[PDB]
Design a protein around this ligand. Structure first.
Ligand SMILES: COc1cccc(C(=O)Nc2ccccc2F)c1
Length: 460
């Protein structure tokens, strides 16, 4: 029974509005409704993994698990296994997998982050799950960010707190936050970004939605504009939105957007918005393709509609050779030529690199680089031909070309990371000097760049 090189992953996000679900929610898991929808010919084909994020979820874990499992069994005739479930307040994540994957999944981690302080601590935050699927690390974050049209900067702060403090994946990757720990990271939820148009334009917006003319609304979506200005979700992807705003609906129909200010809303307007989103970040040159992104039309218990997204994702096998794991394979090596980091810092410490990868027995520290002044007032840290030659555990090109090297640039004075990035070993050639590049981030914000050349030797 061969190991897969691709799986499909379902991501759902639904703010349930503190109401129980209706009796049938199968349209969610079938990717049916509005937007990029899934072909009917696929309806009986199970996804490999289903990841369900809820917000304002009034159910117990038991109650929701029974609904989810019975839903999937009705669609697919497969009894899914529970990988993980984690709840913070009314924010919940469930991961389900096909039974054949049970002995492919390991290293399951869960965590949560509470956002805000005093007044604003007690209902917003995030839950997440990570695990290994054979040779591939997968991370999932469901966040409920701060509400309100005039709080986009609070949402951006909530995002940075969540990616700093959510503790998932391999704890040995100590310089790296969740935006670097996984082959594939999916981040979804009620992100609560709004369409920033004047309150007076509400009925005009409703008109546009009825005409399925979303362009002049999406051009004011706060998440798209904040991402374009590099204020949040740097280096994440989102499929194009082709479904109507998923908030704020009158319950029990989808015919009416309920936008006007009410005591129940704190006298705030809720113009129709794409609150409910799915984004992802995968390591460079790993296969990931969005195959659906949309909202359901027939689940109407909440003031939000559920959102679905599905992905093809590349995965790798748990490789054994006669040498590694448990030793190096001296037929393999990774060399860095002519490498330099460009950093936005004002600091004048010396810096060194750490190279982290599951193709190494343990991380590798470099010598300190040579600091120079860049012509536009930047710090350039030169490593020259000084970088340590990396010794992978396995030399087989079928394994090595699928790997990645995480790089942290650290202060010699404080040992704190000033920037993190990732290099793919999926090269155009072996035994050949080839350009490499990554942006560097810290706390998910841009801090610099790392560039140079690589020379990869495999057994072939
Ligand atoms: C379906 O694949 C796997 C693979 C490895 C471990 C598990 C697992 O431990 N599941 C579980 C057990 C008790 C409580 C909650 C759970 F989610 C599941």
């Amino acid at each position: 029974q061969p190991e897969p090189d691709m799986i499909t992953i379902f991501i759902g996000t639904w703010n349930m509005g503190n109401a129980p679900p209706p009796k049938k929610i199968t349209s969610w898991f079938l990717s049916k409704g509005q937007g990029k929808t899934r072909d009917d010919s696929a309806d009986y084909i199970p996804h490999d993994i289903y990841v369900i994020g809820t917000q304002e979820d009034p159910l117990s874990e038991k109650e929701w698990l029974e609904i989810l499992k019975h839903s999937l069994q009705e669609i697919t005739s497969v009894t899914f296994k529970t990988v993980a479930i984690h709840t913070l307040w009314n924010i919940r994540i469930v991961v389900l997998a096909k039974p054949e994957h049970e002995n492919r999944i390991s290293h399951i981690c869960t965590d949560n982050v509470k956002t805000g302080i005093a007044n604003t601590l007690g209902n917003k935050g995030a839950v997440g799950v990570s695990f290994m699927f054979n040779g591939t690390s997968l991370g999932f974050v469901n966040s409920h960010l701060t509400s309100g049209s005039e709080k986009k900067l609070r949402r951006n702060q909530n995002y940075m707190n969540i990616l700093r403090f959510l503790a998932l994946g391999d704890k040995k990757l100590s310089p790296f936050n969740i935006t670097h720990r996984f082959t594939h990271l999916f981040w979804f939820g009620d992100l609560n970004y709004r369409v920033d148009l004047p309150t007076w334009e509400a009925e005009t917006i409703i008109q546009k939605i009825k005409q399925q003319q979303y362009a002049d609304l999406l051009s004011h979506d706060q998440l798209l504009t904040e991402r374009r200005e590099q204020k949040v979700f740097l280096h994440f992807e989102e499929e194009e939105i082709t479904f109507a705003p998923t908030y704020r609906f009158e319950r029990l129909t989808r015919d009416k957007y309920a936008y006007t200010k009410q005591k129940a809303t704190g006298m705030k307007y809720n113009l129709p918005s794409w609150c409910d989103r799915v984004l992802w970040k995968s390591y460079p040159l790993v296969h990931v393709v969005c195959q659906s992104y949309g909202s359901t039309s027939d689940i109407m218990t909440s003031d939000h509609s559920p959102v679905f997204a599905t992905f093809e994702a590349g995965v790798t096998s748990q490789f054994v050779s006669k040498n590694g794991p448990g030793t190096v394979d001296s037929q393999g090596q990774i060399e860095f030529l002519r490498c330099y980091a460009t950093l936005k810092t004002k600091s004048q410490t010396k810096f060194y690199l750490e190279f982290h990868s599951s193709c190494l027995e343990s991380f590798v520290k470099s010598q300190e680089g040579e600091n120079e002044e860049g012509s536009e007032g930047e710090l350039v840290v030169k490593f020259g031909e000084t970088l340590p030659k990396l010794k992978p555990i396995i030399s087989d090109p079928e394994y090595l070309l699928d790997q990645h090297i995480l790089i942290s640039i650290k202060s010699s004075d404080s040992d704190e990371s000033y920037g993190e990035g990732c290099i793919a070993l999926r090269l155009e050639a072996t035994e050949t000097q080839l350009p490499i590049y990554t942006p560097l981030t810290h706390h998910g914000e841009l801090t610099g760049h790392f560039q140079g050349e690589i020379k990869l030797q495999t057994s072939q």
